[PDB]
Assembly symmetry: C4
Homo-oligomer: 237 residues x 4
């Protein structure tokens, strides 16, 4: 009755996260497998795929679920009391499961290229240390969640809830920007479900060893954005 | 009287699909004929041409025809009872004829490059099987039509009809995103008229042999998006 | 009194066209002079410079002059009786003078590269004939002006006039798209002032010999768009 | 009470300028350190990073501070009496301090690449003289500030102030466009805080010797835009 709206929101987050990972990791593998020098969409094209799909998917789901597609976004909004505990945890599970599925589909379609070129997985690139990767993930997620907070509609909520509706364009652009800066360092995580889905499917020791960075970094970044918006700027009111 | 509005909608879809194919296939041939390494718009530029022209053309025609430019979009909206049978079939014919014309014009302007570089045609790239191409076309069209449904105006319709007006930016971006992911696999069809126009003008056995994928994939993708939006999300109401 | 508004509109078109040519031709020369393979913004970056500056400049001037920046846009709107004769001719002179000035400034800043790399001038590339270039200019300008007509505000006009206000984003995107398709053929003109400014400053026989294409093509494209919108679609009413 | 709103605006400008410099200079260093030919986001990606972050950050801060992120924007608005003297000077200090911090963070994360590849600093490229660089900075800042003035909301102001709210998309696009044209010449400054932050952290004689260009150019460009908008166009009223 409003429980149906709740379950439909969970489904919307599951499916959107699946589509997010399918499109973006297919883009990464498609770029990576390219033999002809500069016959691919390039790193710029990869950054567009991540930012542009967030714009599209937040647009589609904002009125249905709130359009999170990302455990760190759900967590930041939870801390600011904009999402209730049970919804938050249900969203994070839906997101993580959807992400596994989307990456699974890319692997099903292009198994050889998928394994050869890194599986869309986040890890620390050679030359950087884990403190740098962690710092880059915290600041990158801070940019994203600070944008999400600035993009919340104070009056309007997702169907049968108090989860605010979000303006999708600035949020997609924040994701695009952070990818431009962070791809050389970690591939860019800023989204624990996206990092976890790829780790589950790719299944390498190196990737699993770095995985904590892509949970801890984004949760800290999200928490600091929440405190900044709500307490330092008092930008809610 | 409203029959004139009907015929003007058909003309609007014919012309828009012609412009769609002219601009995008001229972009593909112009990229492909380039000798100087990295002197072209690249695959990223091709993906922009397809997404950006959908944004422009849906913007221009949304109030006149509904702005479909694509038999799979018309079919999905038909299944949800948003387009009547006779309009649907008239739109699909207008789209397919316009597409033949637009590709015809590119061939008229650059015949040598046109034949040498593949004629803007969709087919399965070497290394992928038809099951993968079909899967990639279904999911890609699902992203597009799921976006179209989320972009419908519940209150406002095209002139003298009940075909909903569509928000063109998210739709153009969905087309752009799906191109980033799918170009290496099939060139990206997700539009039976676009695939058919190029097949008619280019006229090769290889291309004709793959053509069913670019009709069946998109129609299935569109049907599943329709059912998802209307029955699982109940996102109409 | 409204004559001052008239003269301020002419100044706004002069300055906007100057800025248009300075930014875009500086972009073209900056790309072209690049020695390091793929150390430039590429042809995609050039296409963005033209589309993006039209978006910016139409945004700035739409309420002041109508935001034309382009004799073919002024001519199409003139034919549809949306601009009076004396205003139309004053706008075209302002646009052509501004364009000469903007290209003049690029030459002043980078004289060596400016002359070596073609001076931002439009002409027919080797391999295409003049019939093809003319056809490409007609269709390209048709896309642009068809978009301008679809972007007109039926209720709202520029200050102290009946020149409609225009939605700048779709128009900028139409310019971007047409550049993706047409750069390899003519560089893309679709704007007689832009083509003329560069011809005046660069001053070569080859360029002057092709210059009629960049006036005749766009004026025909604009006229057909006007007739299409107003008479075939009846999209005014 | 409104003094708190004042201090929160200063903090918002400090943090936004820090994020601006971190994301954009990390993008520049990440591009520059790339060994594999065309394995980076390219100069186009760098131009996106600067324009896109201005769009994002102006979006986030427009209702809190006015969204300046740039001493030349604050100065132009000051000259037009849209910002009071004490606020103006407090904003410029906040911006310059934030910029030092953001560049500082990039250096902390990638010290080797940071020093090797120029430190995100603006200076005159080999082949251009200082008159050209100064001219390019004046016109580039004129485009930006002319856009800012055209983007001001006549009715609505930042919290507890008379600083107008700004439309962030056209402003971000103006920054993007000016980067396309100006990167080969100076790297593009058009923002005294951005130029100063990088000079402070990179600390080279060459860079310090050119630094006056990146203060004088933008302040003149801003002043001429202010006079153009307010006195020649009378575009306020």
């Amino acid at each position: 009755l409003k429980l149906w709206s709740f379950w439909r929101a969970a489904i919307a987050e599951f499916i959107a996260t699946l589509l997010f990972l399918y499109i973006t990791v297919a883009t990464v593998i498609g770029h990576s497998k390219e033999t002809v020098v500069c016959g691919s969409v390039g790193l710029l094209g990869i950054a567009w795929a991540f930012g542009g799909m967030i714009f599209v998917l937040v647009y589609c789901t904002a009125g249905i679920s709130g359009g999170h597609i990302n455990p760190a976004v759900t967590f930041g909004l939870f801390l600011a009391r904009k999402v209730e505990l049970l919804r938050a945890l249900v969203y994070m599970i839906a997101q993580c499961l959807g992400a596994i599925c989307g990456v699974g589909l890319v692997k099903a379609f292009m198994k050889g290229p998928y394994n050869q070129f890194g599986g869309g997985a986040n890890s620390v690139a050679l030359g950087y240390n884990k403190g740098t990767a962690l710092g880059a993930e915290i600041i990158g997620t801070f940019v994203l969640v600070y944008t999400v907070f600035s993009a919340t509609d104070p009056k309007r909520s997702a169907r049968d809830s108090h989860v605010p509706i979000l303006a999708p364009l600035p949020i997609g652009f924040a994701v695009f920007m952070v990818h431009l800066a962070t791809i050389p360092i970690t591939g860019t995580g800023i989204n624990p479900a996206r990092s976890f889905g790829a780790a589950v499917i790719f299944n390498s020791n190196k990737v699993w060893d770095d995985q904590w960075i892509f949970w801890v970094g984004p949760f800290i970044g999200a928490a600091v954005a929440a405190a900044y918006h709500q307490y330092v700027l008092r930008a809610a009111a």
